[PDB]
């Protein structure tokens, strides 16, 4: 059981690693579920890549804010 929750600051973004593979869900301002994309963390390696890879694709679908407010630069 892997549930989706708003990605930290992203007003309408969801990200949960469905098992060993990753599942992304993006909503609209009206909260309409737009996109559900799948990733795999096995290719990446670690937890940060898990979140950081999700944000990359999802942002252009309506994900705008921050997942880890620590200024990753």
């Amino acid at each position: 059981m892997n549930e989706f929750t708003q990605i930290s600051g992203y007003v309408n973004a969801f990200g949960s690693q469905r098992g060993s593979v990753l599942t992304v869900k993006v909503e609209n301002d009206e909260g309409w579920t737009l996109v559900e994309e799948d990733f795999d963390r096995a290719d990446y390696g670690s937890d940060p890549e898990f979140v950081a890879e999700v944000s990359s694709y999802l942002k252009r679908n309506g994900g705008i804010k921050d997942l880890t407010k620590v200024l990753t630069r």
């Binding site: 549930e3 989706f4 708003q6 990605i7 949960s16 690693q17 997942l67 880890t68």
Partner: peptide
């Protein structure tokens, strides 16, 4: 798996 959305907000 144990990570999920919980990893994002951290």
């Amino acid at each position: 798996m144990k990570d999920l959305l919980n990893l994002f907000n951290q």
